[PDB]
Every structure is written in structure tokens, then in C-alpha cells.
Amino acid sequence: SVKIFSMLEKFGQFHWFYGISIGQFLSCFKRVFIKTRVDEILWLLYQEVYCQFSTALD
């Protein structure tokens, strides 16, 4: 999760529209549970981060 959020901030640094706040990110991580257990949680987190935050990118 820390790696993903650092990546998202680095994306945000290239354009004023791409900034990412911690709030949405943690909400998405909650969405993972709302919708090898640790592996499942990790894979779901990658999937959900991409689904939620790729729509804000070109």
C-alpha cells in the first residue's frame, strides 16, 4: 500500500489535475474488504486502486 501511494503521488506531481489525497486511497482500501487471505487482499487492492484511480488519468 505504501508503494502504491508513493507511485500515485509521483503521478500527481506531473499535472495539477492528477493529485491524489490519502482519503480516497484509504476509502478504496476499505472498498477492498467491503466488496492465502493476505494474498487475496493484496491482489484486490491492486485491482481496486487501478479501477478507482485510472479514470482520473489520460
Side-chain angles (χ1 to χ4, degrees):
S1 180
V2 163
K3 287 177 177 175
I4 292 167
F5 190 76
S6 180
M7 171 275 268
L8 290 171
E9 288 180 338
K10 289 181 186 292
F11 273 90
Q13 292 174 337
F14 283 20
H15 193 282
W16 61 266
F17 195 77
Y18 297 158
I20 303 297
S21 171
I22 197 174
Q24 299 86 315
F25 179 78
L26 293 171
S27 180
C28 187
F29 178 67
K30 289 179 181 179
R31 190 176 304 282
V32 170
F33 296 89
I34 293 166
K35 186 180 284 184
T36 58
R37 178 62 177 170
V38 173
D39 291 342
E40 182 185 2
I41 292 166
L42 178 62
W43 181 87
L44 290 168
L45 176 59
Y46 272 90
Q47 293 294 326
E48 291 299 323
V49 170
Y50 186 81
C51 291
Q52 183 170 333
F53 294 99
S54 73
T55 63
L57 302 176
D58 63 12

